[PDB]
Design an enzyme around this catalytic site. Structure first.
Site, PDB file in Angstrom:
ATOM      1  N   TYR A   1       0.757  -1.123   0.116  1.00 55.45           N
ATOM      2  CA  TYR A   1       0.152  -0.116  -0.324  1.00 55.45           C
ATOM      3  C   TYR A   1       0.625   1.342  -0.064  1.00 55.45           C
ATOM      4  CZ  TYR A   1      -3.950  -2.450   0.196  1.00 55.45           C
ATOM      5  OH  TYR A   1      -5.118  -3.150   0.096  1.00 55.45           O
TER       6      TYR A   1
ATOM      7  N   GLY B   1       2.839   4.073  -1.316  1.00 56.76           N
ATOM      8  CA  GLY B   1       2.671   4.428  -3.474  1.00 56.76           C
ATOM      9  C   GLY B   1       1.437   4.581  -3.697  1.00 56.76           C
TER      10      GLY B   1
ATOM     11  N   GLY C   1      -1.688   4.260  -4.994  1.00 56.68           N
ATOM     12  CA  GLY C   1      -2.929   2.775  -4.996  1.00 56.68           C
ATOM     13  C   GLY C   1      -2.648   1.875  -3.801  1.00 56.68           C
TER      14      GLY C   1
ATOM     15  N   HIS D   1      -4.386   5.504   5.615  1.00 54.85           N
ATOM     16  CA  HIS D   1      -4.026   6.570   4.558  1.00 54.85           C
ATOM     17  C   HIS D   1      -4.976   6.274   3.937  1.00 54.85           C
ATOM     18  CE1 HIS D   1      -1.931   9.823   2.837  1.00 54.85           C
ATOM     19  NE2 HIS D   1      -2.511  10.374   3.719  1.00 54.85           N
ATOM     20  N   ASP D   2      -4.867   5.418   3.095  1.00 52.78           N
ATOM     21  CA  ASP D   2      -5.312   5.793   1.765  1.00 52.78           C
ATOM     22  C   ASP D   2      -7.390   5.860   2.353  1.00 52.78           C
ATOM     23  OD1 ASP D   2      -3.323   5.370   0.588  1.00 52.78           O
ATOM     24  OD2 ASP D   2      -3.669   3.390  -0.112  1.00 52.78           O
TER      25      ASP D   2
ATOM     26  N   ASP E   1      -3.337  13.164   6.046  1.00 55.95           N
ATOM     27  CA  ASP E   1      -2.220  13.309   6.097  1.00 55.95           C
ATOM     28  C   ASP E   1      -0.846  13.028   7.137  1.00 55.95           C
ATOM     29  OD1 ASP E   1      -2.142  15.026   2.685  1.00 55.95           O
ATOM     30  OD2 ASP E   1      -2.695  12.763   3.693  1.00 55.95           O
TER      31      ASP E   1
ATOM     32  N   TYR F   1      -8.766   8.648   3.197  1.00 59.77           N
ATOM     33  CA  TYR F   1      -8.730   9.157   2.008  1.00 59.77           C
ATOM     34  C   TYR F   1     -10.006   9.448   0.964  1.00 59.77           C
ATOM     35  CZ  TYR F   1      -7.490  12.324  -1.678  1.00 59.77           C
ATOM     36  OH  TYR F   1      -7.412  13.778  -2.492  1.00 59.77           O
TER      37      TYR F   1
ATOM     38  N   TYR G   1      -4.409  22.015   1.709  1.00 55.59           N
ATOM     39  CA  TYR G   1      -4.494  22.469   2.827  1.00 55.59           C
ATOM     40  C   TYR G   1      -2.913  23.381   3.360  1.00 55.59           C
ATOM     41  CZ  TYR G   1      -1.932  18.100   3.972  1.00 55.59           C
ATOM     42  OH  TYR G   1      -0.949  17.060   3.879  1.00 55.59           O
TER      43      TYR G   1
HETATM   44  C1  LIG Z   1       2.894  12.578 -14.813  1.00 58.61           C
HETATM   45  C2  LIG Z   1       3.798  13.303 -13.058  1.00 58.61           C
HETATM   46  C3  LIG Z   1       3.628  13.329 -12.175  1.00 58.61           C
HETATM   47  C4  LIG Z   1       3.895  14.421 -11.390  1.00 58.61           C
HETATM   48  C5  LIG Z   1       4.043  13.929  -9.684  1.00 58.61           C
HETATM   49  C6  LIG Z   1       4.674  15.391  -9.049  1.00 58.61           C
HETATM   50  C7  LIG Z   1       4.163  15.117  -7.254  1.00 58.61           C
HETATM   51  C8  LIG Z   1       5.727  14.492  -6.658  1.00 58.61           C
HETATM   52  C9  LIG Z   1       4.903  14.263  -5.532  1.00 58.61           C
HETATM   53  C10 LIG Z   1       5.151  12.890  -5.396  1.00 58.61           C
HETATM   54  C11 LIG Z   1       5.630  12.488  -4.246  1.00 58.61           C
HETATM   55  C12 LIG Z   1       5.892  12.782  -3.158  1.00 58.61           C
HETATM   56  C13 LIG Z   1       6.094  11.284  -2.272  1.00 58.61           C
HETATM   57  C14 LIG Z   1       4.789  10.712  -1.265  1.00 58.61           C
HETATM   58  C15 LIG Z   1       4.741   9.649  -1.011  1.00 58.61           C
HETATM   59  C16 LIG Z   1       3.753   9.043  -2.040  1.00 58.61           C
HETATM   60  O1  LIG Z   1       2.612   9.052  -0.988  1.00 58.61           O
HETATM   61  C17 LIG Z   1       1.338   7.507  -1.853  1.00 58.61           C
HETATM   62  C18 LIG Z   1       0.352   8.039  -0.931  1.00 58.61           C
HETATM   63  C19 LIG Z   1      -0.792   8.901  -2.113  1.00 58.61           C
HETATM   64  O2  LIG Z   1      -1.814   9.205  -0.284  1.00 58.61           O
HETATM   65  C20 LIG Z   1      -2.498   8.356  -1.120  1.00 58.61           C
HETATM   66  C21 LIG Z   1      -3.700   8.263  -0.527  1.00 58.61           C
HETATM   67  F1  LIG Z   1      -5.021   7.888  -1.237  1.00 58.61           F
HETATM   68  F2  LIG Z   1      -3.557   8.795   0.674  1.00 58.61           F
HETATM   69  F3  LIG Z   1      -3.884  10.538  -0.328  1.00 58.61           F
HETATM   70  O3  LIG Z   1       0.408   7.693  -0.040  1.00 58.61           O
HETATM   71  P1  LIG Z   1       0.306   6.337   1.247  1.00 58.61           P
HETATM   72  O4  LIG Z   1      -0.635   5.356   0.265  1.00 58.61           O
HETATM   73  O5  LIG Z   1       0.640   7.088   2.867  1.00 58.61           O
HETATM   74  O6  LIG Z   1       1.997   5.891   0.455  1.00 58.61           O
HETATM   75  C22 LIG Z   1       3.328   6.335   1.196  1.00 58.61           C
HETATM   76 CA   LIG Z   2      -1.259   3.712  -1.286  1.00 62.95          CA
END
Ligand SMILES: CCCCCCCCCCCCCCCCOC[C@H](COCC(F)(F)F)OP(=O)(O)OC
Ligand SMILES: [Ca+2]
Ligand SMILES: [Ca+2]
Lengths: 129, 127
Positions: free
Chosen positions: A33, A35, A37, A53-54, A104, A57, A78
């Site tokens: 989880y 990442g 999705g 977290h997901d 978050d 959301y 936010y």
């Molecule tokens: C095609 C162009 C893409 C542009 C993207 C640019 C933005 C880059 C910022 C993202 C990278 C930051 C890394 C943060 C971690 C990613 O986090 C991934 C995920 C996102 O939240 C999912 C939610 F549903 F909760 F909203 O968090 P989680 O599922 O908790 O897993 C860690």
């Molecule tokens: Ca996820």
């Protein structure tokens, strides 16, 4: 229903709660989880943080106050303050923004207290998830 | 990591917005087909997906360049310079070898995305 601006803010929170962390590197491809999705069953505490977290959301998306996320996820962001690793969601956030900010914050804190198992990084989702 | 870094993804996002006015990169080019998004495998479902496969291959080539050895441990330290003029992307010549390569990967992909048909029926699939 997620945007780059929102992901960037979540990344910021993780950097706040966990000094020296590199969010994409550490949490964007971990377990089932962590990442974008997810599927299957979380493999450990950290993975459960992500699944939780997901789900939070998903709850946010079901809020009437978040209806605008159906067509404009990138139009909302936010505000939060980071002070000495402490995360505080801004009082000016509207109902939807506040709920998401809290989701978050809970996740960032959860990440900061969960063990990190390198063996679960870049997991073979096509076998374990 | 996949995507190199958050800041690298943000730069790529900015370049896509340059090439495609009104685009929302994560919303449009993420979780599309077999290659647009985290990794990818199988047969690209369409031209756009092939654009993504090519971009993924490019980032892989980047990580294998001797000039990009610093990306091995500190990928989040990379950043390049480019200019946008009426959807035209120009990678700055001051970019060093590694930065230049990555800027080129992003530029080729942004252009590819702008000319590839967008098939909504290829969003959120499974490859
Ligand atoms: C095609 C162009 C893409 C542009 C993207 C640019 C933005 C880059 C910022 C993202 C990278 C930051 C890394 C943060 C971690 C990613 O986090 C991934 C995920 C996102 O939240 C999912 C939610 F549903 F909760 F909203 O968090 P989680 O599922 O908790 O897993 C860690
Ligand atoms: Ca996820
Ligand atoms: Ca990909």
């Amino acid at each position: 229903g997620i945007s780059s601006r929102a992901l960037w803010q979540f990344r910021s929170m993780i950097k706040c709660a966990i000094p020296g962390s590199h969010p994409l590197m550490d949490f964007n491809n971990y377990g089932c989880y962590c990442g974008l999705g997810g599927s299957g069953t979380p493999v450990d505490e950290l993975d459960r943080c992500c699944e939780t977290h997901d789900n939070c959301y998903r709850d946010a998306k079901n809020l009437d106050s978040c209806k605008f996320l159906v067509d404009n996820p990138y139009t909302e962001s936010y505000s939060y303050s980071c002070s000495n690793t402490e995360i505080t969601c801004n009082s000016k956030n509207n109902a939807c923004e506040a709920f998401i900010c809290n989701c978050d914050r809970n996740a960032a804190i959860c990440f900061s207290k969960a063990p990190y198992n390198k063996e679960h990084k870049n997991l073979d989702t096509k076998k374990y998830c």
